[PDB]
Design a protein around this ligand. Sequence first.
Ligand SMILES: O=C(O)CNC(=O)C(=O)O
Ligand SMILES: [Mg+2]
Ligand code: NI
Ligand SMILES: [Zn+2]
Length: 331
Amino acid sequence: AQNPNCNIMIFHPTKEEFNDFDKYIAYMESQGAHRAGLAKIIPPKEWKARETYDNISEILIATPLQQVASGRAGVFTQYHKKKKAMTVGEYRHLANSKKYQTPPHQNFEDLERKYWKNRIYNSPIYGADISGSLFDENTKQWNLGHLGTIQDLLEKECGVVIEGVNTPYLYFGMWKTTFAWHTEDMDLYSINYLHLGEPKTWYVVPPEHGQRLERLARELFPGSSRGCGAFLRHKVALISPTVLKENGIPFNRITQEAGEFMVTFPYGYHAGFNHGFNCAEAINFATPRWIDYGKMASQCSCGEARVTFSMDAFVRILQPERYDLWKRGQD
Ligand SMILES: O=C(O)CNC(=O)C(=O)O
Ligand SMILES: [Mg+2]
Ligand code: NI
Ligand SMILES: [Zn+2]
């Protein structure tokens, strides 16, 4: 078995290898990359997502989210308070203000220590989940707005045509902005490209060990666990590396820098934080290997998780028994 310790793998495709996205994902899996839950892909040196980032300031963040924490430094939840709209130029200036800017630090490890020590005492503002793309239409390789759609994959594998669309999302971050522990909707893959700015640190649990993380989360968030049998779908809970290590949960960590792709694999729990002002683009995707994960994915039916239009069909076709109850949660 390849990669039996479930280490995060880093790949350096050539420009020739960068042509066929599906083929390269399958290659990475042949080497065991999925066992980690997360892989890094450094694009060939000839490749670029677009020519410059000089003209992005007028993108609107219609509903910036202030991420307010509750709990203790290593075990906390966050809720998202909606703020007034602002442009990317306005948000960058905010991120660079004295109140919100990255503190002085020695290296990424020092900054990670400062994040876990101090995150809960601040409420950074995240421009998350903004439909759109920063890939130039002329970028033909690994253009996250030109991927094969999940609906077409389900149709190719299973023969059933379904409604729904699959488009990317932009994320504008600042110091301490945080993504809570989660897997993707329907335990899909994700791909994330860091277009610009400061790094993003990731934590990930191997898919084969995901239920260990779930069990710990039920212990650490016991009221949330009584409320919902899949409360990590709410995307609000944080657990630090120190607490994971104290409880024996297998995980790995890695820092993504501007110009790099990350792929999350089916049922790979992940969480992380931004180092400073940045912009990322991410989208879900599927392969044939996903189908079985989609069929077994947990679902929130308590009503909190509220997701896209397109997840309806996935539940309806892959999880017909759950359909009824899950849809009640969505309506
Ligand atoms: O970058 C972020 O805030 C969160 N991204 C992801 O969870 C992802 O790409 O799957
Ligand atoms: Mg603009
Ligand atoms: Ni994710
Ligand atoms: Zn729920």
